[PDB]
Structure 1
Amino acid sequence: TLCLGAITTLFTALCAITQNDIKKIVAFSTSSQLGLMMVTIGINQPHLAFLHICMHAFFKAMLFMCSGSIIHSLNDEQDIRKMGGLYKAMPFTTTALIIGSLALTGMPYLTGFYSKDLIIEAVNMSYTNAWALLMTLIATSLTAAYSTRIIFFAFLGKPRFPPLVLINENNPLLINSIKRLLIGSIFAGFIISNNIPPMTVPNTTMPLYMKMTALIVTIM
């Protein structure tokens, strides 16, 4: 299980960093995260895998919803090469996608931190295959890589879409849906973590450099 998860997450993250369809990038991110869950199952933390599933549902669904809003606005276009500057054209969609990408990449104290940080720190502190450890670290870096790829090519720069601009996200249904999933992706990690019994034994003693390893590789 550990080896299968490690190869899955590394390969999918390596594939995702060069895709041009936004939906394909998001799908490959889901596949890599499933590989990570299989990894954490392989080192005997099933409750961590369940917690990660619960945390991942929120921001993954909301990332897909932001992608769908972008697609519908730009006359059913999915290629990131034809999306220009939507940071100012799409305030709410940009903010939602930024929060989602930060939560996916384990920004501390967001919903993704409370599972991914523990998973990485528990993989580091275990009698485990070294190759799987290395591939897990490289995969968690490539996660940040494809997240910033999506952000850079979708929101920054000058427009590249056809000149008949039909951008409009001012619809109550879309706004309410993404707002609900945003509240979830911001607060659900803390709310759920502080409300379950302790089903694991914590790693209270860590070398200082190994405590921030996920943060370091994400920044890199």
Structure 2
Amino acid sequence: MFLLAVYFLFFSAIANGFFGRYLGVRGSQLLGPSALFLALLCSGTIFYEVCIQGCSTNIKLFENFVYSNELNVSASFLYDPLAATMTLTVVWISCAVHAYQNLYMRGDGSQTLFTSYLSAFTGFMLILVAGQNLVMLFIGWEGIGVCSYLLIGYYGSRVSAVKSANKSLIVNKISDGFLLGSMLYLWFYTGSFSYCSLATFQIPDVVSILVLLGAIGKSSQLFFHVWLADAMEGPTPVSALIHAATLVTAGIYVLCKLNLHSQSAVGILGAATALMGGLFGLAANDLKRVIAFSTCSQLGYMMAVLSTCDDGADFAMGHLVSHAGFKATLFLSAGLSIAKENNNFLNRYGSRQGSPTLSFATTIASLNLLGFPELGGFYSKESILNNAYINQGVSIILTLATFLTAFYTSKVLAQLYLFPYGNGRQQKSFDIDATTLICFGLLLSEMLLRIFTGSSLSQNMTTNLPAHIKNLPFWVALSGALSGLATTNLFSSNFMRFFGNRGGFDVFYARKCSNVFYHNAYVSYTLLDRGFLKLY
């Protein structure tokens, strides 16, 4: 029963991408959503069996996947509470994205290949989450990396999309290299790759740094966030999957599965990434970019909370699962707005008659991001902010990030709906089928269920804080939202420009790192092999 979900996704991938000539566009519009629905039924069974009823299961497919001398690893799947929760969230979001793609990608030539890549992408994410050993996780990590390369660069005749895919691939190579080094350290000194025997009470700092460096790649933290903003070249369904669940979450999942992180580093890196991402999102004028910077900020919050307390891992995973739903909703709604208006710029959006479902889903997702009380996003974010009070540095930065988050989120909501119409007087239209309505029904259902069921066991446990300190996140969010509605100026033009250039990390890489890389290549080749050592 547990294997079935992975089978359904890989089957949908093979069918759509190898037998699409027979199935057709309509055949992929059937087999994709059907397989994802079946996988949702299996994931729901897994979630009930493991999470609610505390029944972890291990399925060993085969032994001796790698058998060289002492080194021995097997392909085995352990469904633990973290795996069940992530499997459920991933499959729910993927099923929604598959339903969404039926209408969105009708205007794209390869809808069969797109559906195939989406299902293979979901399968590799489930392999990463459910792996019982570090090698299976690496298999999933690389599979999602390759699927992202094949999906971001889907538009090959655009130089920006191919460059965005190359950027993703290179950054992910650097990260998985650090991970491979850490896995080698852990195998050598613990004797196994299985997480049960992997447990080490005291680990040398080197392994901790290598683990963190590996994780900061997929979960785009500071210095490694360049690829996320660029990943906007790909079609909207890809962005929803990568940002909401498949890619950003993997780093957090790795850090939570093996608690080798160092408190000092994770807190500072997280709080910095939260603030920087919020500031970058303030300057952004593309709808899809703002939601990416919001993803960066939220990832910063999840990374930061690990430092605060022992329950930080539970709080981080709880935020991760709460975030995937609303963030997916934000991307799908942004895509539909872009499709309906033929515009990507916030300036040209405005009030216009539309579907009630889409406008409500956008409002509720934005409210969850903002932190509106009595919402799934609110509980998962307050759990972090309240517990971070002990670390004075992390708390102050995270509150400032909450303010900036509220400001941009409110500005975006005002610009997309409240603001008067800003596009031209030309005939534009995108009619929504019942499949899109089902997709939004699924996202809203996830959002509602999250409030009733919660995200962590310790979510509502009392944090012994004065009332003024416990309710401050709300006041900061409200103040930011009010300032964002008024569309006031917060920073001087020098800083607004700085934030628009994203801190100039990419300008540094191009002017110095890329030039050094190609000078090393020039010395290695032109000066030496084909110069000094080449005959006349």
Provide the identity percentage. Answer: 29
> Residue 411 of structure 2 aligns to which amino acid in structure 1?
R
Q: Which protein shows a greater Rg?
A: 2
> Residue 424 of structure 2 aligns to which amino acid in structure 1?
P
Q: Name 2:321's counterpart in structure 1.
A: 54
Looking at structure 2, the residues matched to 200 and 176 of structure 1 have their Cα atoms a distance apart, in angstroms, of: 30
Looking at structure 2, the residues matched to 201 and 56 of structure 1 have their Cα atoms a distance apart, in angstroms, of: 18
Q: 1:29-84 CA distances to partner (integer Å, 9 max, x unpaired)?
A: 00000000010012231110011101110000010000010011112x11111112
Looking at structure 1, the residues matched to 472 and 419 of structure 2 have their Cα atoms a distance apart, in angstroms, of: 32
Q: Name 1:123's counterpart in structure 2.
A: 388
Q: Is the Cα–Cα contact under 8 Å of residues 122 and 203 in structure 1 kept in the other structure?
A: no
Greater RCO (Cα-Cα under 8 Å, separation 6 or more) = 1
Q: Name 2:468's counterpart in structure 1.
A: 209
Looking at structure 2, the residues matched to 217 and 121 of structure 1 have their Cα atoms a distance apart, in angstroms, of: 13
Q: Is the Cα–Cα contact under 8 Å of residues 287 and 334 in structure 2 kept in the other structure?
A: yes
Q: 1:119-166 CA distances to partner (integer Å, 9 max, x unpaired)?
A: 111111x2x2x2322110000111111111111111123212122233
Q: Name 1:12's counterpart in structure 2.
A: 277
> Residue 399 of structure 2 aligns to which amino acid in structure 1?
L
Q: Name 1:66's counterpart in structure 2.
A: 333
Q: Name 1:94's counterpart in structure 2.
A: 359
Looking at structure 2, the residues matched to 21 and 96 of structure 1 have their Cα atoms a distance apart, in angstroms, of: 20
Q: Name 1:112's counterpart in structure 2.
A: 377
Looking at structure 1, the residues matched to 367 and 423 of structure 2 have their Cα atoms a distance apart, in angstroms, of: 26
Listed as ranges, the matches of 1:1-220 within 5 Å are: 1-44=266-309, 45-75=312-342, 77-86=343-352, 88-124=353-389, 126=390, 128=391, 130-193=392-455, 198=457, 202-220=461-479
> Residue 113 of structure 1 aligns to which amino acid in structure 2?
F
TM-score if structure 1 supplies the norm length?
0.89
| Distance apart, 1:200 and its partner CA | 8.1
The more displaced of 77-86 and 50-59 is 77-86
| Distance apart, 1:201 and its partner CA | 9.7
Higher fraction of helix: 2
> Residue 35 of structure 1 aligns to which amino acid in structure 2?
G
Segments of structure 2 that go 5 or more residues without pairing to the other structure are: 1-265, 480-536
TM-score if structure 2 supplies the norm length?
0.38
Closer/same/farther in 2, CA of residues 92 and 169 from structure 1, 3 Å limit: farther
Closer/same/farther in 2, CA of residues 169 and 121 from structure 1, 3 Å limit: farther
Please, what is the CA RMSD of the aligned residues? 1.8
Q: Is the Cα–Cα contact under 8 Å of residues 376 and 451 in structure 2 kept in the other structure?
A: yes
The more displaced of 77-86 and 48-57 is 77-86
| Distance apart, 1:182 and its partner CA | 1.4
Q: Is the Cα–Cα contact under 8 Å of residues 89 and 167 in structure 1 kept in the other structure?
A: no
| Distance apart, 1:207 and its partner CA | 0.6
Q: 1:97-129 CA distances to partner (integer Å, 9 max, x unpaired)?
A: 1100111122222110221111111111x2x2x
Looking at structure 1, the residues matched to 329 and 270 of structure 2 have their Cα atoms a distance apart, in angstroms, of: 24
Q: Is the Cα–Cα contact under 8 Å of residues 110 and 187 in structure 1 kept in the other structure?
A: no
| Distance apart, 1:192 and its partner CA | 3.6
Q: 1:161-191 CA distances to partner (integer Å, 9 max, x unpaired)?
A: 1222333443111111012101212331331
Looking at structure 2, the residues matched to 160 and 46 of structure 1 have their Cα atoms a distance apart, in angstroms, of: 44
The more displaced of 36-45 and 156-165 is 156-165
Q: Is the Cα–Cα contact under 8 Å of residues 2 and 40 in structure 1 kept in the other structure?
A: yes
| Distance apart, 1:216 and its partner CA | 0.7
Segments of structure 1 that go 5 or more residues without pairing to the other structure are: none
Closer/same/farther in 2, CA of residues 199 and 136 from structure 1, 3 Å limit: closer
> Residue 62 of structure 1 aligns to which amino acid in structure 2?
T
Q: Is the Cα–Cα contact under 8 Å of residues 96 and 178 in structure 1 kept in the other structure?
A: yes
> Residue 99 of structure 1 aligns to which amino acid in structure 2?
I
